[PDB]
Design a binder for these strands. Structure first.
Ligand SMILES: [Zn+2]
Ligand SMILES: [Zn+2]
Lengths: 214, 96, 91, 24, 199, 127, 100
RNA sequence: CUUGGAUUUACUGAAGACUAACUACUGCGAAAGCAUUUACCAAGGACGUUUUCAUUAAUCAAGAACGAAAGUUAGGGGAUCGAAGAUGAUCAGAUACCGUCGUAGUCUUAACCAUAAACUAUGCCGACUAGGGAUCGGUUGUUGUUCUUUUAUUGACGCAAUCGGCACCUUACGAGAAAUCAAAGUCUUUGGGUUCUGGGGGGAGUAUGGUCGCAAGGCUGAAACUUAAAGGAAUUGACGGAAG
């Protein structure tokens, strides 16, 4: 009776320069009218796109980044980092029997007051000459792994901003360092940062946004 | 650990129990260490540790109350403070 | 000898008011007439004045407490909560 | 009948027996 | 007398003339004689201190809280009661608190409150057991005891009076728009009967 | 190039929702259920009904400007079963053959980390 | 008489194991006694792997599997024929069937 | 329940519960039970011991502590499930099974109750008897192994051992009515110590008395009367709205 898609105008999404394939895609919204402005009503939205899409490589196909729009520049949407997560297939593909699982999480603020909960998951590695079926680590050892796992998680996030941290998340620097420092304790495999959560944001700094958008 | 060293000093060394004896021992300079219970009044505590500053005597702050300090000394009564005149077989003075 | 098998301090009420109401009174009236250890001077000389007022005969320190006990359950929970919230805020 | 229900039937019967004795 | 909570007399110095000012606070549980009470924006988070609401973290237990800036205390003043600071909305300078009745309220962060729980709690846990105890209770409050049931009166005295049997006769739920002389019973009741389940 | 939405598919053992949103998920571009295309409550979740629900979505997806959709299939989840329903599998096939292009595919069936008690009781539902 | 030495469950050196709900009928069943089957199925049916690989905008996109661990009670599993009644002598065997 | 926008979608927010997957013929605990992190508190088994005391021990009437779930009393919480109840079907009828709600309850703090197929249906302590391989904690000697770190005095893995366990496979010297049993053996070739319990089936764990409990109930506990059987393991057949 009205054809409701008559006043939907498409806007273009832009990912930050920390990401390579910055053209995430397009959206729709009711066109800017006198009462409600589309510019105001479209910010704060969350876009969930696979890390393989924003980077090209197919090795990141199991990590997906949430992108939050915080400002609109005419027809272009300027977004910011909102979080990290694994795909349900991948985490299931890692949790097998006869092996020990260890998880750790910690809350820490970045250089510019970005409070985050970082979730890291690791598994015991099976030796190549191993005969016995089960690869079980003692609970005291897993406490040592978790305790080491949090302090490195704290150290590498509080000393760098989110953009510097996001540039640490792309190659999994922390994942490589967690595995490196736990070598003396127990051989670990598939060490990952399986989730990053934005808890609290400070006052919006439009200057720092454009610094990550040109 | 400290409760063990303090207990050893009781059965072996010399000590005085009570506020009046502790101040009287600090006046003569015979005190090697002063121990003050947690719930000692702050006014009394602050002037026990004023004499120790004058007497050049270390002060140890016991974590229990005068009830727990008393029972550490083997006493069936409350000991708000004590001074160790002669550490005996123990080494509490060098441990503090 | 044991003068009363079960009524205890509520033996002053005789047979009146019902057993259930007498049992609820006994729990709290034992507590409000008990002597508690003073946290300031260390002696067991703290007794109730009016409700919420607990005086120590020795050191003459008066503390605000519960109606029938020197410390209520919620007060101790709050003291630890405030102690915890205090140390985080001040690092 | 089932033993559990025979037990329950007696339990409700004992309770009636106890009450009718309370009338005296 | 008439109050279940104890009162604390607290002496302060007058900032502008050589004088001592005595203040009557509601004693928070754990307050003792000779204790130092700190009041102000820069006071530390200790039981008995008076702090603005904005200066307290979430989950802080507070009492004698102000609804308005400078009314000197309105909320959570009876024995065993307290106000929980649910949250902060700093940019309009507001704080969400939970009242002893469960109501959520929004107050200016400049409103003040005393840290801790009001003393004397648990007072209701003991039965009165005696008409004499209630008589003594209201001897120092007001003349509201004992209460005759309206259904036991005559039609002149109460809307419920009269009849060859003691009974209300009409519905005891009364409209909010009723007038004085009619509002006897359950005024503007949304529901009646035994409370089953959660509300 | 491609105008990517998201085809959010819920496949229960009673219904199949074919729901295409924007990439944000806050705009509904097309939502067709298996039960709007059938006349019996029993087959409203059938694979055939899912095909019909999927094809008309692509018709609506085409006219708006959507040319490629990501697949986010889910089951009932929560305390209930995690196995995808018959409709989600046939609807997924029906979409690719309608000209709509496909990118990433993922299962987002909600999974509890315990959980609340499951309906049915201790002895289950006895049939 | 006694049908099994394990009493139908796998609880030894133990007092209590928290139960699980049957996938089918939502019945409480002890975790050790519950018949557990771990399945890893392809998300798309084998017939549709081709045309969905032609609509793919990504070249050589390795589609995911679906991971699921199933729990059944004795009546759930027997009725669904996941397990079958075996002979008295074949009950002793607990080695997995060799079908895959 | 839904054109008063249901269902569905994304984000934000709050409550209570519960700690998925890892998770096992794996661990701890007297049993009941115990599965998110960390901090603390006080305990504990096993191993190691060329430390210490020297019989301090085993089982135990009477008497104590703990004791799943449900239930009881008083506050707090009450998301979900959900007795009762109401409901829509099914049916000859179903106030049943199926469906939709739902009150106590489910959670917790104070106290009771003291029972379960509380089962290994197998008392506890002690000794011996037949082979085998896995596995947990400890400890003792050792690698074409990767890592620490580039190596040790890293860790993991691998191979030999023994202690203790939770168990499992085969055999039957032997036992058993048999199923089966590494104890249910070492029992007519009848004797290691000790506690408790049973004497055909019902009546009946009923009545009564006593005793404990707020109550619900627990503990103790007959008789009259009645009956030739009740029951255990296995075989054949018959039958199955079971599988092949
Ligand atoms: Zn005192
Ligand atoms: Zn069943």
């Amino acid at each position: 009776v009205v054809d409701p898609f008559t006043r939907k105008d498409w806007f273009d999404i832009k990912a930050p320069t920390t990401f390579e394939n910055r053209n995430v895609g397009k959206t729709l919204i009711n066109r800017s009218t006198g009462l409600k402005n589309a510019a105001d009503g479209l910010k704060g939205r969350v876009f969930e796109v696979c890390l393989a899409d924003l980077q090209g490589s197919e090795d990141h196909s199991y990590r997906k980044i949430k992108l939050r729009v915080d400002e609109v520049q005419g027809k272009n949407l300027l977004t910011n980092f909102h979080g990290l997560d694994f795909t349900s297939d991948k985490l299931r593909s890692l949790v097998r029997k006869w092996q020990s699982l260890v998880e750790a999480n910690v809350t820490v603020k970045t250089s510019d007051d970005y409070v985050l909960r970082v979730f890291a998951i690791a598994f015991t590695k099976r030796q190549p000459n191993q005969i016995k079926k089960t690869t079980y680590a003692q609970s005291s050892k897993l406490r040592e792994v978790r305790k080491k796992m949090i302090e490195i998680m704290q150290r590498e996030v509080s000393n760098c901003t989110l953009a510097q941290l996001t540039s640490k998340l792309i190659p999994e620097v922390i994942g490589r360092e967690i595995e490196k420092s736990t070598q003396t304790i127990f051989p670990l495999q598939n060490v990952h940062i399986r989730k990053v959560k934005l808890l609290k944001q400070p006052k919006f700094d439009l200057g720092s946004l454009l610094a990550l958008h040109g | 650990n400290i409760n063990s060293k303090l207990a050893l000093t009781i059965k072996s060394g010399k000590y005085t129990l009570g506020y009046k004896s502790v101040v009287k021992s600090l006046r003569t300079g015979k005190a090697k260490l002063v121990i003050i219970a947690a719930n000692t009044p702050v006014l009394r505590k602050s002037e026990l540790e004023y004499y120790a500053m004058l007497s050049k005597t270390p002060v140890y702050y016991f974590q229990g109350g005068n009830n727990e300090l008393g029972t550490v000394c083997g006493k069936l009564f409350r000991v708000g403070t004590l001074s160790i005149l002669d550490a005996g077989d123990s080494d509490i003075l060098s441990s503090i | 000898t044991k003068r009363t098998k079960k009524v205890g301090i509520t033996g002053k009420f005789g047979v009146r008011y019902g057993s259930s109401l007498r049992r609820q009174t006994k729990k709290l009236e034992v507590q409000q007439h008990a002597k508690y250890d003073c946290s300031f001077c260390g002696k067991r000389t703290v007794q109730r004045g009016a409700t919420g007022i607990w005086n120590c005969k020795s050191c003459k320190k008066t503390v605000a407490g519960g109606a029938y006990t020197v410390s209520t359950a919620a007060a101790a929970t709050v003291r630890s909560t405030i102690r915890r919230l205090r140390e985080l805020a001040e690092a | 009948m089932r033993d559990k229900w025979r037990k329950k039937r007696v339990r409700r019967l004992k309770r009636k027996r106890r009450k009718v004795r309370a009338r005296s | 007398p008439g109050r279940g909570a104890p009162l604390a007399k607290v002496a302060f110095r007058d900032p502008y003339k050589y004088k001592l000012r005595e203040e009557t606070f509601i004693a928070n549980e754990g307050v003792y004689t000779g204790q130092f009470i700190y009041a102000g924006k820069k006071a530390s988070l200790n039981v008995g201190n008076i702090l603005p609401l904005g200066a307290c973290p979430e989950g802080t237990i507070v009492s004698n809280v102000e609804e308005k800036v400078g009314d000197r205390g309105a909320l959570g003043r009876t024995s065993g009661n307290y106000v929980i600071i649910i949250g902060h909305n700093p940019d309009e300078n507001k704080t969400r608190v939970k009242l002893p009745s469960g109501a959520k309220k929004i107050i200016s962060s400049d409103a003040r409150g005393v840290i801790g729980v009001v003393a004397g709690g648990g007072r209701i846990d003991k039965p009165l057991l005696k008409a004499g105890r209630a008589f003594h209770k209201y001897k120092v409050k007001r003349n509201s005891w004992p209460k005759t049931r309206g259904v036991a009166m005559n039609p002149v005295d109460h809307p419920h009076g009269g009849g060859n049997h003691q009974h209300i006769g009409k519905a005891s739920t009364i409209s909010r728009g009723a007038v004085s002389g009619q509002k006897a019973g359950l005024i503007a009741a949304r529901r009646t009967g035994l409370l089953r389940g959660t509300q | 190039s491609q105008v990517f939405g998201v085809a959010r598919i819920f496949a229960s053992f009673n219904d199949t929702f074919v729901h295409v949103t924007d990439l944000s998920g806050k705009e509904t571009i097309a939502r067709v259920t298996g039960g709007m295309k059938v006349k019996a409550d029993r087959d409203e979740s059938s694979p055939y009904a899912a095909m019909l629900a999927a094809q008309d979505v692509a018709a609506k997806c085409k006219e708006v400007g959507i040319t490629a959709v990501h697949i986010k299939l889910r089951a009932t989840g929560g305390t209930k079963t995690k196995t995808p329903g018959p409709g989600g599998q046939s609807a997924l096939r029906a979409l690719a053959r309608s000209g709509l292009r496909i990118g990433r595919i993922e299962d987002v069936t909600p999974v509890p980390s315990x959980s609340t008690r499951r309906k049915g009781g201790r002895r289950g539902r006895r049939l | 008489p006694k049908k099994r030495a394990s009493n139908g469950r796998n609880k030894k050196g133990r007092g209590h194991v928290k139960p699980v709900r049957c996938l089918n009928c939502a019945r409480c069943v002890p975790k050790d006694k519950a018949i557990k089957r771990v399945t890893i199925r392809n998300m798309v049916e084998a017939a549709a792997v081709r045309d969905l690989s032609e609509a793919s905008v990504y070249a050589e996109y390795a589609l995911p599997k679906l991971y699921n661990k199933l729990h059944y009670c004795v009546s759930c599993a027997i009725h669904a024929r996941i397990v079958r009644v075996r002979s008295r002598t074949d009950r002793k065997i607990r080695t997995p069937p060799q079908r895959k």
